[PDB]
């Protein structure tokens, strides 16, 4: 039996594994933000805390963990935990969609030219590192009194037992981390008046940080299991859902539409959509890109047209006219739809057909700009809701010219990944092979040559078209 | 009683017209359209000839046109009709629409630079003059033959009378005829190294030119009654409408825009896109440009948006969100009209798309008026009619946007015919004036522009002008 827990935004969901990689338990308690002033956004890490042990607690009650063997932890990422030399809280943590410390986020550029060549990223507002930057400046009384600084996800490790760590793809997430050497950037700390010694151990993902404290373990009904390192939301949710070797890549459609792919190796392209980073697993990088924005994109347009359904458009995509208009919808990504207008003069199936091409067009350049990185898939695991529509999932092939392999499942999240990493560490013998399967295949969509020639050339609108037009 | 005919591009349709100037009857039979190659737009002008009749006969079932005393004909501009010494077609007639000419434009004002001020107009390939420049070139075999050159509703006339002529506002656009002097230019016909004697005879819309000949007046059951000039459909539409003396104009949105003003003299302002011609009445001029077909826009957004009728459009409109950003419609004329929607968001509903299109659309039609007013135009109030003014909310909006009084009119339903019968009232009524035979339409209702939406409106059409300007580039 295997324990995952993730720290997400909304709450904190943990998960109980039976031996052979099924989900046998499941719980979640809500968590509330806080939003002091505009673009802050911060939790009280007593209250993950508490919201975890609550959460275990309503777990062991329903199934006793007394056979648990291992536990690993996922958790939203870039969020800083300041905590004093007594491991007590300073202040409350500053989230990954906190924004107040963007100008502190040009300074630390400022200060190490070479940032975005270490970090492989260009320097956010969510990031980790700006914002200690931020809290020393606006808050010195407390930056003094710094002794550790931890992410989300291993301020719970710290609770659970007594230990400093935190994985490489959390790590990277900070700005501390040099991505490449998976280790922390003295160049980058000191720009920020920071020391290893105040950052937590690095380990990978699947490496044991340590054991759960008596007290905790009595208090969840469970022996002293050991905790592995775990992941980052997004790396711990590619691990559960086995994307994990080298080009691989899934696409998820989406209250985001995100391109996740592993990599051979350290790539990046900060001036980009691009994020670098490490994955929850030894020797292992990935490239993620965030795009539309096909849930939001496709109903607008189905109200837009009278429509309610986005089954509907869909449908009415279907029985436009080869009148060739063509249409040629450009959307804009806040957010927001810039928005493009179009060309035409016909009718509301045919807008519903430009409309699921625009989309189209905008997702197969998101995923050619990772994939001219150093990523080139053989397949695409296609999953979420935006993609139970067969005919827009066809599309996606012949626009794309990628193989896009349609699975189910893909619910519970980072925290599947947490007990499969914990898995991993509990069985030294079975390989990852073995460990980390992937969603059950439902339908596979090759591009259609016919259909895949004939647009490459039409996307070549999203070529001038998308460029002579911005303004916006 | 009196018949007008409207041969246009799609159909002929015949009416009679009682005489008090009312429509007792009406019937149309359709035409086809030759598209052979890209640019090509032919007809038969024989096709011509048996819609014409076979409407005229179906006219006749319906009442006796034993009492009809004039006919007048009106028809589609600028068609090139090819005849030999025996009176036979030599090739299709090129029609309006038709482009293979673009070329045999440029050379024609290149070996006649006064052109445009002869002819006071663009030479354009719809125009007539250019495509028999182009048959010179490329069928100078056809060419050799040619003994007369018609339009189209002057071969329609040769047929029922056989008189070869033709009226100042149809000759007009021909680009043969010196416009300002109502008579044709030696210099535009040399050019074209044609003569007067391939040329008909040249009258004013509202003069006789011939009778119906015996077996026509006997096969369509009338007499052998005079038959009057007529003029272009836009011209004789205008009589119809009542649109004669200078400063007297009207927007028409209907299937086709036209927007159709009586100059004060005759005004030359080609290098725009307004068009300067003789009007089909004596001592008239007049300038007309192309306009958007609101009413096929209007169509086309009730259905884009579901809401299936023009009225729930124009009710929509008004329920948009006036927090939602603006919405841009930009209407690109070449109905058609290509479009572009510039600057859509999640806030952005069918309401506020509605609203987004009546406004582009006006503002693109107060702007087309615009360019004709500051030609010389100077109209205190504007009539108008069609199908797209059907609706008072947009009359005034509209209105309000161009800051000109419109009063809308019933009865542009009938169209030039209506004109056609109207020039043969005159005919055969000598010793009346116009003031009595051509009334203006029933006043429906007069909109006055508000001034608060007026100036509400006018920095969104200086940015409705920019934005254009701006993709009229990625246009065409």
Same mark, same amino acid.
């Given at each position: 039996?295997?324990?995952?827990?993730?720290?997400?935004?909304?709450?904190?969901?943990?998960?109980?594994?039976?031996?052979?990689?099924?989900?046998?338990?499941?719980?979640?308690?809500?968590?509330?933000?806080?939003?002091? $002033?505009?673009?802050?956004?911060?939790?009280?890490? +007593?209250?993950?805390?508490?919201?975890?042990?609550?959460? #275990?607690?309503?777990?062991?009650?329903?199934?006793?963990? *007394?056979? =648990?063997?291992?536990?690993?932890?996922?958790?939203?990422? $870039?969020?800083?935990?300041?905590?004093?030399?007594?491991?007590?809280?300073?202040?409350?943590?500053?989230?990954?969609?906190?924004?107040?410390?963007?100008?502190?986020?040009?300074?630390? +550029?400022?200060? =190490?030219?070479?940032?975005?060549?270490?970090?492989?990223?260009?320097?956010?507002?969510?990031?980790?590192?700006?914002?200690?930057?931020?809290?020393?400046?606006?808050?010195?009384?407390?930056?003094?009194?710094?002794?550790?600084?931890?992410?989300?996800?291993?301020?719970?490790?710290?609770? #659970?037992?007594?230990?400093?760590?935190?994985?490489?793809?959390?790590?990277?997430?900070?700005?501390?981390?040099?991505?490449?050497?998976?280790?922390?950037?003295?160049?980058?700390?000191?720009?920020?008046?920071?020391?290893?010694?105040?950052?937590?151990?690095?380990? +990978?993902?699947?490496?044991?940080?340590?054991?759960?404290?008596?007290?905790?373990?009595?208090?969840?009904?469970?022996?002293?299991?050991?905790?592995?390192?775990?992941?980052?939301?997004?790396?711990?949710?590619?691990?559960?859902?086995?994307?994990?070797?080298?080009?691989?890549?899934?696409?998820?459609?989406?209250?985001?539409?995100?391109?996740?792919?592993?990599?051979?190796?350290?790539?990046?392209?900060?001036?980009?959509? =691009?994020?670098?980073?490490?994955?929850?697993?030894?020797?292992?990088?990935?490239?993620?890109?965030? #795009?539309?924005?096909?849930?939001?994109?496709?109903?607008?347009?189905?109200?837009?047209?009278?429509?309610?359904?986005?089954?509907?458009?869909?449908?009415?995509?279907?029985?436009?006219?080869?009148?060739?208009?063509?249409?040629?919808?450009?959307?804009?990504?806040?957010?927001?739809?810039?928005?493009?207008?179009?060309?035409?003069? $016909?009718?509301?199936?045919?807008?519903?057909?430009?409309?699921?091409?625009?989309?189209?067009?905008?997702?197969?350049?998101?995923?050619?700009?990772?994939?001219?990185?150093?990523?080139?898939? *053989?397949?695409?695991?296609?999953?979420?809701?935006?993609?139970?529509?067969? &005919?827009?999932?066809?599309?996606?092939?012949?626009?794309?010219?990628?193989?896009?392999?349609?699975?189910?499942?893909?619910?519970?999240?980072?925290?599947?990944?947490?007990?499969?990493?914990?898995?991993?560490?509990?069985?030294?013998?079975?390989?990852?092979? +073995?460990?980390?399967?992937?969603?059950?295949?439902?339908?596979?969509?090759?591009?259609?040559?016919?259909? &895949?020639?004939?647009?490459?050339?039409?996307?070549?609108?999203?070529?001038?078209?998308?460029?002579?037009?911005?303004?916006?």
């Amino acid at each position: 039996m295997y324990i995952g827990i993730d720290l997400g935004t909304s709450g904190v969901k943990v998960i109980l594994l039976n031996e052979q990689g099924e989900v046998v338990a499941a719980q979640t308690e809500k968590l509330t933000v806080s939003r002091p $002033h505009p673009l802050w956004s911060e939790q009280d890490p +007593e209250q993950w805390w508490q919201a975890t042990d609550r959460a #275990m607690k309503a777990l062991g009650d329903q199934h006793s963990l *007394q056979d =648990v063997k291992a536990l690993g932890i996922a958790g939203q990422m $870039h969020g800083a935990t300041l905590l004093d030399a007594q491991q007590r809280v300073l202040r409350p943590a500053i989230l990954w969609n906190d924004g107040r410390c963007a100008q502190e986020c040009t300074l630390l +550029e400022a200060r =190490v030219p070479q940032s975005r060549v270490i970090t492989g990223n260009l320097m956010m507002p969510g990031f980790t590192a700006p914002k200690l930057l931020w809290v020393q400046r606006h808050e010195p009384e407390i930056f003094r009194q710094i002794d550790k600084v931890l992410l989300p996800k291993d301020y719970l490790r710290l609770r #659970m037992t007594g230990e400093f760590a935190s994985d490489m793809s959390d790590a990277a997430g900070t700005m501390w981390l040099d991505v490449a050497k998976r280790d922390w950037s003295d160049v980058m700390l000191q720009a920020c008046d920071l020391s290893r010694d105040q950052m937590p151990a690095l380990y +990978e993902g699947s490496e044991i940080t340590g054991a759960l404290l008596p007290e905790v373990a009595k208090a969840w009904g469970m022996a002293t299991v050991p905790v592995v390192a775990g992941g980052g939301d997004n790396a711990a949710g590619a691990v559960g859902v086995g994307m994990v070797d080298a080009n691989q890549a899934m696409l998820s459609l989406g209250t985001s539409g995100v391109y996740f792919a592993v990599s051979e190796g350290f790539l990046s392209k900060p001036e980009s959509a =691009v994020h670098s980073f490490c994955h929850a697993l030894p020797q292992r990088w990935h490239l993620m890109s965030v #795009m539309l924005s096909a849930a939001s994109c496709l109903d607008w347009a189905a109200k837009l047209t009278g429509l309610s359904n986005v089954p509907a458009l869909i449908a009415a995509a279907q029985q436009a006219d080869e009148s060739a208009e063509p249409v040629w919808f450009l959307p804009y990504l806040q957010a927001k739809g810039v928005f493009f207008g179009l060309t035409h003069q $016909h009718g509301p199936n045919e807008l519903a057909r430009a409309v699921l091409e625009g989309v189209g067009y905008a997702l197969a350049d998101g995923m050619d700009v990772v994939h001219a990185c150093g990523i080139k898939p *053989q397949s695409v695991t296609l999953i979420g809701g935006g993609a139970r529509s067969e &005919y827009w999932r066809q599309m996606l092939a012949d626009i794309s010219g990628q193989q896009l392999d349609y699975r189910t499942g893909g619910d519970v999240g980072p925290a599947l990944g947490a007990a499969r990493l914990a898995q991993i560490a509990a069985n030294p013998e079975k390989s990852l092979i +073995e460990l980390l399967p992937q969603l059950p295949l439902e339908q596979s969509h090759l591009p259609d040559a016919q259909r &895949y020639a004939a647009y490459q050339p039409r996307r070549e609108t999203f070529r001038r078209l998308y460029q002579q037009l911005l303004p916006l």
